[PDB]
């Protein structure tokens, strides 16, 4: 089958064939996406040529994420625009 395996939060190098997952190759259409905190682990798992860095949130998006976390009355204190308050 043409599978896609999303491998979440790997913390050590492990062998795919020992867990049952075949390593995808160029001849096969299958993909395998793994996430980890360590670039060393992603290099050990042969993902060096397709590495993506998960960067922190932007200045604007970090604020509206903070806004959605506040209660209705608390948000109304820091929501208002046009006027400026401390």
């Amino acid at each position: 089958k043409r599978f896609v395996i999303l491998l979440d939060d790997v913390r050590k190098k492990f062998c795919l064939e020992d867990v049952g997952i075949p390593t995808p190759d160029i001849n096969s259409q299958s993909k395998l996406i793994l996430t980890s905190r360590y670039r060393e682990v992603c290099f050990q798992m042969n993902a060096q040529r397709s590495l993506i860095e998960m960067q922190i949130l932007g200045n604007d998006a970090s604020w509206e994420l903070f806004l959605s976390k506040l209660s209705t009355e608390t948000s109304a204190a820091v929501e208002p625009l046009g006027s400026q308050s401390a």
Partner: protein
């Protein structure tokens, strides 16, 4: 005049046949998911359902309906004669297919083991010249026991993986290619080696059989 009722019964049979076929195909797909192959008798039954093409007579009957305005005369009765016998020709086949596919109990059979099953195919560099040396004995060498030696990490195991996977590309007279990992221990974990051989020879695993008795059995089995 039986056509007006028989064609109505054909529509019931057709819609029931699609239901039985859907059950069989879903049941067969659950077998192919287990790497089994669809049973040959089911495959014949499925192929007959596909080839039936019940929509052909439906269009032919649809044209007779337009001729049905004055079908009593011999001008339009020519078409009605064929349909009155063609419905029964497809109704009995449809009903026979109903009671055949409703009577299946096994839908797949486990195929025989492959001559050589693929092993991990990693990207290898500069291994062509050594693989040529290994093949030069395997094809031509006088002794039937071949030994490959080298320091740790030089590529001995990877040579076997690329050698085993290369056999399935070429043509050879051999019947089974077994890859056994004796690296598991220096204590020779005999049971797990016999499991690999028996699984590769399509043999049942008699767990309680003593190791010495199995070893005598595998010698006879591998000797064939």
């Amino acid at each position: 005049l039986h056509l007006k009722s028989n064609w109505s019964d054909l529509d019931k049979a057709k819609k029931l046949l699609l239901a039985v076929e859907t059950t069989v195909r879903a049941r067969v797909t659950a077998e192919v998911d287990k790497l089994n192959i669809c049973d040959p008798q089911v495959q014949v039954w499925l192929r007959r359902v596909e080839e039936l093409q019940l929509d052909a007579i439906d269009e032919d009957y649809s044209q007779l309906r337009k001729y049905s305005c004055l079908g009593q005369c011999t001008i339009h009765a020519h078409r009605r004669a064929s349909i009155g016998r063609r419905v029964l020709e497809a109704l009995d086949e449809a009903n026979k297919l109903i009671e055949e596919g409703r009577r299946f109990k096994k839908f797949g059979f486990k195929p025989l083991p492959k001559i050589v099953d693929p092993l991990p195919q990693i990207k290898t560099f500069g291994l062509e010249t050594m693989l040529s040396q290994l093949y030069d004995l395997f094809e031509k060498g006088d002794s039937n026991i071949i030994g490959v030696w080298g320091q740790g990490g030089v590529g001995k195991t990877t040579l076997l993986h690329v050698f085993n996977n290369d056999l399935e590309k070429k043509a050879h007279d051999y019947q089974v290619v077994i890859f056994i990992e004796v690296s598991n221990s220096e204590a020779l974990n005999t049971v797990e080696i016999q499991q690999t051989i028996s699984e590769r020879l399509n043999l049942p695993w008699n767990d309680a059989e003593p190791i010495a008795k199995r070893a005598r059995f595998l010698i006879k089995a591998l000797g064939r």
